[PDB]
């Protein structure tokens, strides 16, 4: 009986284990389908492109229920076959400084999908093992590097609304050169076009909202603004209040 | 896409071999069931 007993309970584990890897065999097929569906689409040769929105759910889906498969597999290559070439595709058109919210809520969806668990919170430079740090590296980044030649500081509000929608989802690696490499002697190079005495637009308007994201990285730049500033303060005169409002 | 792609190739047919190895050990293990069935009917009758 005790024989008996013991297959018995192993025939059911049998049963709870064939159930379940069967399960398995129905989603791994779909899996399939989906990534020769993706492949297909894809292509040029195929009428019906695969949409952005589309490549998402394709996403979602693999991610909630075949998790395995992205765990097991190069989930970097996979977003960098598949991703990369539609996210180059919609962000083509985009210009940050007229619609600084224009993909902000599909590449944070993206960041749920292709950021790995570990990485999250570091955002650093893993061009090696991450499917979104290299996203942004690549697909967001050139965009980034041009508008920032053509931007104008005087005119930081459409950059600062930018940079603050995108600070809480792009890497920080990314964020760290930009504001070092990029934002940084553009400043410098603003305030030295910037004249106290003739500009009609005051220096806080457009420098005081980088005091959140940059802080103490500013501080060399105080030292130009207050020479210049000490430049128009020569002909000012106490009874003048506008020098202490600004 | 291929690189993926032939990972999941392989794995859905290898999960379908280890289903067929647990099929086939579930129609072994009911055999071995059958011939202990048998033994326990036949102890119970002549224990009684």
Known sequence: ?246 | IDLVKKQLKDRLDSMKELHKTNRQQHEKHLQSRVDSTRAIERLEGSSG
């Open chain 1, 1 to 246: 009986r005790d024989m008996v007993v013991n297959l018995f309970h192993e025939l059911e584990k049998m049963t709870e284990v064939l159930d379940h890897e069967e399960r398995v065999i129905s989603n791994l097929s779909k899996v399939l389908e989906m990534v020769e569906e993706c492949e297909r689409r894809m292509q040029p040769d195929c009428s019906n492109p695969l949409t952005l929105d589309e490549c998402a759910r394709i996403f979602e889906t693999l991610q909630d229920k075949y998790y395995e498969e992205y765990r097991m597999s190069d989930r970097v290559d996979l977003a960098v076959a598949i991703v990369y070439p539609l996210m180059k595709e919609y962000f083509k058109e985009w210009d940050p400084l007229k619609d600084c919210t224009y993909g902000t809520e599909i590449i944070s969806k993206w960041k749920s999908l292709l950021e790995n668990d570990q990485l999250l919170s570091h955002g650093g430079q893993d061009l090696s093992a991450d499917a979104f740090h290299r996203l942004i590296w690549e697909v967001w980044m050139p965009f980034v590097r041009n508008i920032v030649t053509q931007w104008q500081p005087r005119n930081c509000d459409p950059m600062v609304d930018f940079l603050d929608s995108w600070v809480h989802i792009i890497p920080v690696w990314i964020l760290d050169n930009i504001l070092d490499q990029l934002i940084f002697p553009k400043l410098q190079k603003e305030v030295e076009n910037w004249n106290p005495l003739t500009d009609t637009v005051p220096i806080h308007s457009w420098i005081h909202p980088w005091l959140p994201l940059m802080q103490a990285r500013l501080e060399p730049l105080y030292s130009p603004i207050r020479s210049k500033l000490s430049s128009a303060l020569q002909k000012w005169h106490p009874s003048d209040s506008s020098a202490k409002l600004i």
